[PDB]
Symmetry: C3
Subunit: 423 residues, 3 copies
């Protein structure tokens, strides 16, 4: 009966009300009630979005790659990958700066030795890259492996267009029927996304409420300085790095944020950027006028290998652990941090649990090892204690970057529909 | 050269001849010979039907949900879910009455104390409900999970019609092609079902022969009284609850039974209600003139959450165990049994191995705990010795109940083709 | 600068140069460099082909089985199954003969008793056949199970044609839309196969280089005599068994080999006959003019259950193991070897790891049990040390056999497009 009220204001209301409710409920210790009675609605939201990810990516990308020439596709890939690597480097640098500014971990005062022992491996760059090519697309679809689905969909769309420009008519009509099936399937997926966003304010309320209820009490002391530094840094990544790059390429930054708000809040509360994809792709299509041939490729690629927020978070936690055990990082060490954070975004691309794998990687890069019972393990466990509060903002900036790079690359390909940007 | 003989007579011939053959073979100790040389033909039958179950459900429901309004679909869902719960409670009630009538387990005379060991909880009501929404539909498909497939199929068909009512013609043609692909897939599945029913008499013979050969010798003494009670009770659920409910809503009970006979025998020999689905849906369409938009939703839902036969069986075996250890159940305990049996059919919806889980739930509700080496454990182990003999009948009544509810709901929606019911 | 160069010359160049590069690199011990820097390009080739296998099999067979009568489908199946069994028995027989000729394992001189404790057992034939019928075709697709996919695809195509010959227009239009979705999918797949064959010279070079670099050093002494015996036997299976059967049914054997070349080299370096399937089928369609209704059924079936090369290898290795432990095989024991090798091709149909399982079966059939630490176990490990050098050749002859039988059945069904066999 509440469907008639506008949706976007509803999602903002749910964000604020779930936040206030969760703080008030967890401060009085009723956070277990929140986990039991409030959370499953946010879980329902998250499952409803996650359901759409595999069909909408596959279908949108067959369609888009078909509707575009391979030369342009390759050009878009080169552009978006450069944009991604550059923005990740910027975000590590920002995390380093805001951490040094907030002087994070300076008052934990742990005594620490000089011992160093490795934990996880980087999956070999060669094996990860080879793993981009699926050996069974039905299996990748069933397993939800995004990158090989991207690869298979691109190949299929390119094949479909080559077949449609052939002389035999049976060939054209077959390929055309196939492309119709993908086109209808993607059309339906975006329809359902719009339907689920009707339920979205409830889920936003529930997710933000549970995260504030379980982890609000923990935002005090040195971890409070961590939360403040991380969130200020994310804010800087948005209002400086994104606004300036959007301003250079002639996109009004405020119009961009106003349009992106739904994808942003969905990322902020589901803490899954892949599970925000249906909202992100529909936002790119029906708000920013990006052509399917751009966003249907850049946005899943970006959910997988483009996490500015995570990079900034790594920049803060390396400072936190280093200052916490008493060995602040030398300039060259911070350069090593930036370099390895970007290389680690590439190296763990698509690997499950790559969050902790990259963090172990960066820490290992400057000589901070997670040996059990050591002070470094202790400080890292300190951070993981507020990892969810951080995950909200981290995921939000991860998705927002994807949208900003998609709009920039599109404007540079004249595949951006200007009619949506007129006041 | 045998195909020419009519199918229905062939299936009856296979049923009766397999029963007599299996009894004669288990009496002469050749039941292992039956397991080795006769059984694989029935296994072949079962594999051929189970092969069709996933595609036919996915496609028939995309199509059906497209051909119907969401308001009507929801109305049908409420009708069938009410019908399901009501007939399930009735079946527990009948099992209790037929159990008291046969005085089941009265002469086992096991001594059992007043000792009580606390056990684990039943699978969560909330998580099974959330499990209805898939997080990857390709994955639910690969795993054979019916309920998430129903959910995805309904969402997809609804999206498809809303797309077919758009102004742009490319969108309509895309959606129309997608629907054509699903319509062809469903037509082919039903074609194949009819082909498999030609091989059905052989497999029916083999399955009934293996079950009689392995478990004929065990229908003696107290377990024979159990078999008599359970089969009498199922017969009552059919001839009282189903016939009275069909007469109340104006469906000829005898024509119903005659049309459902193929689904009935198939369920009785395969003891899997989910695997009789292709035959059941074919009977709903090409024998009872039920509209696809009703049965394509109610019949898979019914295979999953509507087991009158299992409910009656639980009523009989809970009385059997209570009498065998020497503590007959008080009236309020039997009420607790009925309430718990229905709620446990809901709570275990789609859960693998849900049969024993429901039985454990019902037993624990009245304080008969299955501690190993206890007399209660012994009584349950007695019953399991005849589980196949019982499984035939209870699966049969499970599926027949599904059909009766589909025909009644269709009749109330004027979605029932009256021409198939006049001679 | 690459694509314009002719294709056949490039793949042969990559094969010869990769082999010489790998020998020279492993003969000087740089095989670790090859495994690290050269191998991953060949791995990329193998994955690119493996990707296409499930889609192309499903789609080609829905389309093909629709485009053919069920009576003809059955006739083709019986023909190709007889051909497969006969050519397999011939291959075990040839392996025995070339083994006797090279006197394989004759100078290993291990002492062996006559006690044998049963360790292996056969996987049930009945369950192996029943597994042909999938119980979830989406699951068989996701698990990469070929044989049950074949079954589902044939059922679906047959249903589709029966629907397309019905009175209602809506049903025809539905079934035909479905058939076109599969036809479009298959057309795209073959398009992609041809595209991937552009990278083939690199990947062929890399695979052959890695195998030569890891295993060249081991082709000396008794295992060298094994390599010579096996490759001679494979060559004979091609030049006698295949050439005579093609000549008998009126197919020019030289035209045949010239056409099969891509499938042959691809099978030879990837050592996966199922994973060579996309190249084999594109060669059958776009080189030999076999109708989709023949090859879309016979080639994946043969990739799964028809291994002339593996059978010849078993023929050689059983004589090798027997001579190596000092108990040469009786004539009737050799007949049991042939009979069980053929039966073991069926009994493991689609079973994972069926290579070693068939070898264990054939060994056990003549009383050589692979109990750990026994001398028979030791001789088997000797053989396994060169399994890659042997896998190249036996996979090549496996696939070549599939092609030859497909073309013969096609000639007998007048489903072979003779215009592809006229030279100017
Ligand atoms: C207690 C909460 C329970 C809520 C669950 C019920 C969901 C009901 C859906 C109502 O919301 C609408 O759904 C449409 C899709 O069904 C969307 O159409 C949208 O989707 C199309 C995409 O094809 C766009 O082109 C259209 O512009 C656009 O109106 C539309 O935005 C949205 O308002
Ligand atoms: C593993 C190998 C096992 C081998 C088993 C043998 C396979 C069966 C051979 C085919 O037999 C025919 O198949 C038709 C398929 O259509 C059936 O028509 C059925 O389907 C159509 C429904 O539209 C209608 O023609 C009829 O109502 C209905 O009899 C029909 O009964 C039957 O004569
Ligand atoms: C990791 C990156 C790997 C990328 C793979 C390399 C791409 C190579 C560039 C494209 O080369 C062409 O691509 C076509 C396929 O797209 C092929 O068409 C072929 O396929 C058709 C099949 O329908 C035939 O009819 C045509 O004659 C035939 O030219 C063609 O041979 C090939 O020269
Ligand atoms: C339940 O067991 C498992 C199993 C696997 C997993 N994760 N795999 C994975 C991979 C990448 C990330 C990046 O993370 C972002 C962040 O944290 O900054 C943020 N969450 C976002 O989506 O952008 C995170 C996780 C997690 C739990
Ligand atoms: C490996 O085999 C499997 C595979 C999956 C499962 N889980 N799903 C499930 C859920 C409920 C039942 C109740 O069963 C009915 C009965 O006994 O009254 C009768 N069989 C029937 O279908 O109406 C039976 C199974 C169980 C066994
Ligand atoms: C995808 O990962 C996998 C999946 C499966 C496996 N093993 N299963 C298997 C391996 C080989 C064969 C027959 O072997 C042939 C031979 O050597 O003679 C030769 N290799 C050929 O291709 O014809 C039969 C079954 C290994 C890795
Ligand atoms: Na980035
Ligand atoms: Na994610
Ligand atoms: Na991202
Ligand atoms: Na019921
Ligand atoms: Na079942
Ligand atoms: Na049922
Ligand atoms: Na053969
Ligand atoms: Na293989
Ligand atoms: Na083969």
């Amino acid at each position: 009966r509440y469907l008639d009220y506008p949706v976007l204001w509803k999602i903002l209301w749910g964000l604020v009300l779930g936040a206030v409710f969760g703080l008030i409920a967890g401060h009085f210790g009723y956070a277990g009630a929140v986990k039991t009675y409030i959370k499953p609605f946010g879980d329902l939201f998250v499952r409803l979005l996650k359901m759409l990810v595999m069909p909408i990516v596959l279908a949108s990308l067959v369609v888009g790659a078909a509707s575009i020439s391979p030369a342009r596709l390759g050009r878009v890939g080169v552009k978006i990958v450069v944009y991604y690597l550059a923005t990740s480097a910027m975000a590590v640098f920002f995390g380093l700066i805001v951490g040094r500014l907030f002087n994070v971990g300076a008052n934990v005062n742990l005594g620490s030795g000089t011992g160093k022992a490795i934990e996880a491996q980087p999956p070999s760059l060669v094996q990860t890259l080879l793993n981009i090519v699926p050996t069974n697309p039905f299996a990748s679809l069933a397993k939800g492996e995004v990158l090989p689905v991207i690869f298979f969909a691109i190949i299929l769309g390119i094949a479909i267009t080559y077949l449609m420009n052939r002389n035999e008519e049976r060939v054209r009509k077959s390929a055309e029927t196939l492309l119709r099936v993908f086109d209808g399937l993607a059309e339906a997926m975006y329809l359902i996304v719009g339907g689920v966003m009707q339920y979205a304010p409830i889920g936003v309320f529930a997710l933000i409420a549970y995260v504030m209820a379980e982890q609000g009490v923990r935002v005090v002391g040195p971890l409070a300085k961590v939360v403040g530094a991380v969130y200020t840094g994310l804010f800087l990544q948005i209002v400086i790095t994104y606004f300036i790059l959007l301003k250079v390429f002639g996109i009004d930054p405020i119009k961009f944020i106003r349009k992106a708000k739904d994808a942003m809040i969905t990322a902020f509360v589901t803490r899954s950027s892949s599970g925000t994809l249906p909202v992100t792709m529909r936002v790119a299509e029906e708000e920013m006028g990006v052509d399917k041939g751009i966003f249907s490729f850049t946005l899943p690629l970006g959910a997988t290998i483009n996490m500015d927020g995570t990079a900034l978070y790594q920049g803060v936690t390396v400072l936190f652990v280093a200052n916490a055990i008493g060995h602040p990082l030398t300039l060259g060490q911070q350069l090593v941090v930036v370099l390895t954070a970007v290389l680690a975004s590439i190296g763990t691309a698509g690997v499950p649990g790559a969050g902790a794998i990259m963090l172990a990687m960066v820490l290992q890069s400057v000589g901070l090892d997670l040996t059990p019972g050591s002070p470094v393990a202790l400080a890292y466990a300190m951070i993981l204690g507020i990892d969810a509060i951080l995950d909200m903002g981290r995921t939000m900036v991860n998705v927002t970057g994807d949208l900003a790079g998609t709009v920039i690359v599109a404007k540079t390909e004249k595949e951006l529909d200007e009619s949506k940007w007129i006041s």
